[PDB]
Amino acid sequence: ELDTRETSLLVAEVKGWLMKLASGKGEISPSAYDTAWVARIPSESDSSLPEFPEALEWIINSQLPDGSWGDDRHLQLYDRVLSTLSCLVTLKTWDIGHNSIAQGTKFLRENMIKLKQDDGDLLSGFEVTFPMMLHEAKQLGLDIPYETEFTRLLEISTKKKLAKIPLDKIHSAPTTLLYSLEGLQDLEIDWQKILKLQSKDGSFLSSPSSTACVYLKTKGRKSLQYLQNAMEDQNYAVPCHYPIDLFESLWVVDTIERLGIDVFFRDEIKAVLDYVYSFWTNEGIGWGSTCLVNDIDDTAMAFRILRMHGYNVSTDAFNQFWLPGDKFCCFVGELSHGVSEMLNLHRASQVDFPNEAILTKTFKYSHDYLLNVDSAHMDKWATKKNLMGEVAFELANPFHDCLPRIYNNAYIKHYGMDDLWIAKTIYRLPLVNNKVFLELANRYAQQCQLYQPAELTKLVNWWHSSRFEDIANIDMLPYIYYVICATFHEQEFAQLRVFFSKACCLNTLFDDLMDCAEELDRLQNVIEKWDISLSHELPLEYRIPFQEFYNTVLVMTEAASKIHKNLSPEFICKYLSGIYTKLIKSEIADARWKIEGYIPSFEEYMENAEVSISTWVHVLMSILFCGEPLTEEILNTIYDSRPLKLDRIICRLCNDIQTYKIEMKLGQPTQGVSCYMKEHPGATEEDALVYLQSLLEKTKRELNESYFITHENDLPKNIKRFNFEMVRMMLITYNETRQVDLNELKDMIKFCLETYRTLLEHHHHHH
Template sequence: MAISTAAWSAPIWMTSTTPNAGQVPRNFSSGLRPSLTLGARLSDLLLSRSTCRNKTLGDNVGAVHTTNDSASRVPKWRNYAHRIHSSATEVKELETTDNKLSANSSTARPNDTHMQAWIEEIRGLLRSMFEKGETSDSPYDTAWVSLIPAVDGSQGPQFPNTLKWIARNQLEDGSWGDVDFFSIQNNVLCTLMCIIALKSWNTGLDSVEKGLRFLRKSMALLEDETHEKLVGFELVFPSILDHAKNLDLDLPYNLPVIDKLRAAREEKLRKIPLHLIYTTPTSVTYSLEGIRDVVDWEQISQQQQQTDGSFGCSPAATACAYLHTGNESCFRYLTSIPQLCDGAGTSAAESDVRGPVHATSLTLTTRPWPFAYFVCMVMISSLRIGIEWIISLQDVVYVHVLEVADVEMTWQVGSALSNPWYEHLPRLEHRSYLDQYGPQHVWISKVLYRMHSFTNSVFLKLAKADFNLCQSKHQEELQVLLRWNEERGFNSIRTREKQMVYCFYVAVCILPAPEQSMARTVWAKLAMLNVLIDDFFDSPSESYTDKVQFLEAFRSRNPNLMDGTGGEAKLFFESIYNTITEIAAEGSLFQGRDISHHVYNIWLRLVENQFKEAEWKHLNYEPSLEEYMSVSEVGISFEAMTPTQFFMGEKISPAMVDSPHTKRLMHLANVVARLSNDIRTYQREESENKPNWVSISKRNGLTESEIIEEARKVMDEHMKQLVKETYSPSKSHPLLPRSARQLYFDTVRAIRFAYRTGDALAPHMLDTKQSIDSILFEPVLL
């Protein structure tokens, strides 16, 4: 018998904060229209393609192909703009290419029937998971549970089938572990625990000897620093090795690597405030068997036991606790496992290691979900299980202690270092996971394990199809925006189409869902207007008089005041003014009230502050740092993007807009955005005689490196406050809806992402071009 997937128990955030299975979860939207869950809108879109794509271009781009010839599949952004207007020719070319690909493809294009079948299969998988849990069998946990003696006083184990399972599942090399993925730490740990179990009951001695031979030749390999590292290995392994020594198992106990692990364990125990584990949920509880020699069992049993009787939802930790305490709740938890799963020990409810954690006790990763990341969220929502806990996992902050093995480590490390959570774009991460992960991957925690309900080919197919379906919708929107860009005359005035493509690309990265179409389009238009206004007031070819008239015309909302301006200034003003007027009118329809004054006031502040900077330059005035920040905070343009909040599907009252909390959000975001710009562009701006945080601070005798270091400290502190105000705000003032606060935060992340290596609008950069291609033009391949 083996303890397997049934050791999974419903996490706290499901049992205590979410609706019952039959209840409809609280919807995000309480305003104009419900914000569809992704699962609901997938079904909706499948029934009505016209909602998301047309019958020609959409069918082609939404397909999942198996060819590697990405260059011939769809037009890239570098040549897409000038071809987009001849859409009939474009569609014909795409259809011809797609027909050729389909003829050579061994995998049929997923159609509506395929998609619906995948959705239903995943729903079934997730229902099953929530009923009994599903992680792969764990030799390590099975071995721990096998140590429980019979409670009736007879000589033997309480769960004898666990020993049979252990003997039956030894690998050819004498070890225990994952059949298809070898990890030295995992195989050594599982093998050591399994031979302890067999030796303790004086059974399977041939298996014990084979396991000892494996350990004797393999333990020295633990010295290799390149292998996958299990969570808490340095806590657990030395403790279990002491157990083996007490059983007189013939092992090399004095290897240098063993001494290093013991030293690391002692160092970690010195850093762990043990009194906290008795009062605060931590991941140490999950590895309780590794500290069994220092823990106060009576105290921890009173304080930290889960409602199901387990410790950390771990069979190993719970079995260890029962062996030390005889706790009946522990026994009930362990007894429930074989009844559900035919005998193999699971690696436990890995997903429930949550709450405050001590940084020295585990390795944290902010990327717990592989390719199933957002489609998993979809299906869970559509099952009506509740969505608040999804947001907690998806956004921050305490995420589970997982890593995924069998993925190129350089990609994982490089991606994590170059894309910190506060300056990465979620859509880019989704695409990276789709390209990098597959159903063969295993998960790393205390031991290796697999989650077949999440990492499977059906999830992968549906995730890819969903990405491509959304991408086809985005391409249609881009066509409309490029036509708008041309009709407004922006192409001929002062910019090129690729800047419109770039603005829309960022909008897609922070607002990717089809139901966010209007918000996404508005965000992209506002971003484009920002670029144009910034260029106008920066441009030496525009006269100072024209800039004065522009400001007066905007203040009075009277385009006629632009009469007599030189060049194309009047046409430029009318194009911007008309676009803002249209956005205000559409937003009023969405909100069911007049919001035009909000929109105009926001953009008037931007124009006034842009003019103030132009005036400083015209007068050769050198502002103080305080003057500069009071003006340039608004001039950085973050605030000008906020009218997008009126298109997010929720009502926003005047009290919310004018709330002190909203003003604080705005201030924090403006400072971060301004400094992100200034530490990257100060050299160019100095050459243009423009004030900048860095250049102004130099007057105080500081070096550039000192100024930039100080700016980064200010940014980091403001980002921490912005995170708090976004996710855990005080309720002493009216609050914007969660979706609007998230929009603010994601817009700041987008700005930080854009300024990571240079100027924000730098579509000439190779990595930017590749990112745009992957998000807007290249379907994901199977």
């Protein structure tokens, strides 16, 4: 337990943070290096006085107890040495803070000799920023070491890299050197020309210190004003980049959604996404509302989250980052990029709509990159708690093959409540990384488990009293409960979770029985009539599931009639028996085609195989309990709606692709791969599967579009949601990477088996 307060207190606090973010106000730790840089500036009124005296007081009051400045909780020598240097140079320049200078130089005298290679993350621009700062300290005659094997090797290397940069490319187009111009002060820079590469707020890649250098080289008005306002907005201790209102708000929401605590924050999240959307363009976005360029990380992040929330955003935003070879950059003209942006690119590419081929290219490229990372070495200094864990999860879990609580429970183990971030120096994003998010995540995760014992206990009791043991393994039940718990986790969906579980069990039994039967006609006879009276003519193995199927329908009909007062019990019960008879007989059909010698068309086989796929019946039943109002027109048209068509197609294709070898290791002809082959001579099975795999991927894009966008005359929200999750519960069942892994599910299996034993012993205990 990480926080003591009531949930209501935590939730109110985060709501405050989110509404501040929805007005562009966030929280980034100050940068001692940047605060000291900007405080070099003298007032224009009186050049003998500082423009930012409060920043000089902050420097003096923020020195750490060992004489250094920098990140308090994670000591990194690069961060401490660079930050302390800057602070010393500025206190000395203004001839103040004699004691602080004394502590600072002493710290540097004990630790400069400790600087080495591969001792932490290269801070951004470190190669120029540290030698420059060191040289400025010497010009001031500070009493610190001025040469080590490390510092002279660094200066030699940097001088060679700088001597190879043609300087006019720095003034010609945006480069990452704009972030660290203070590291270039002594270079041959046409500072006047550099002014044309400022951001719309007068900053240079949003770096206060780099902006500060330009202002002292040029006295440009907009750059002073950017600093004056950043100083006043941040209370006179500025971060190393400002503002990052787009980056910070999207990462905070993303964190909230990946932890699965967005259930508490729906309105506030929408407010933040409206703020972000007011800055969305057809060329994406950068980290902030005044930044110079767009980047692929922010653009992928915003595209994915906005689209998932029903906003209209275009994949044209990704064209600017295309490179020959169907590769991508993070900023145009970059020389390399990192893993966070490919992770987010990879995630974004899977919410593609039809005819958005650029996202197939960004998917292939990011997937390929992510497959090739050096995992032994990725984030080896653990700025994040488990970045390589997030990569591995993302590679292994396709968006449509993953369920919400499965993703959330995995991220909860990855989430670092005290992660740090690397830029000019080390910084913190306490709104992204904090113990409050993780405590709320753990509490909601425990809420999702609370109802499971009782729900599982009723399911096992229903299994026993239905006499399924008298024909039949019960292991099927914890698994079915597991996936519906992961998709409809909110406690209010209990009737949905229980009825869905019963329905899936009943059909799994019937389908299994029929796939090993011919007097299916003796059965279709009874089922056609749906008459519990003619149950007695069934051969017992069909009698047990039939009578429980008939009973569960009545039970479902009573619960639904209590819920839906406008629907008559008779309408509901004709509907439920109708859908289950249609499914069952279609399952007899798929059976008698598998016994006789019939490989049909592809159109004909899949006309019956799409109804046979059983998936739509759980949609049609479950919507009775999904919390949405219903009408007869809805229940009469739902089977033919576009999202239900797509459901049936995707699940049939998936089944026929993923089981194909499991089918011919064993010689079975009636399947989509064969039926395709009987219609395209010269297609190998390799080409049939390729075609079916392509049709599957195309249908998934149609399902994305039908789902994330709210159309005119669209199905109610929770209904579209169930249909969406029904496809996913199907697909993950065939994601064989995940299946052999699968934890919670073993506990569910054990709980069910213990509950069964007690039932079978009639609670008499045996040794």
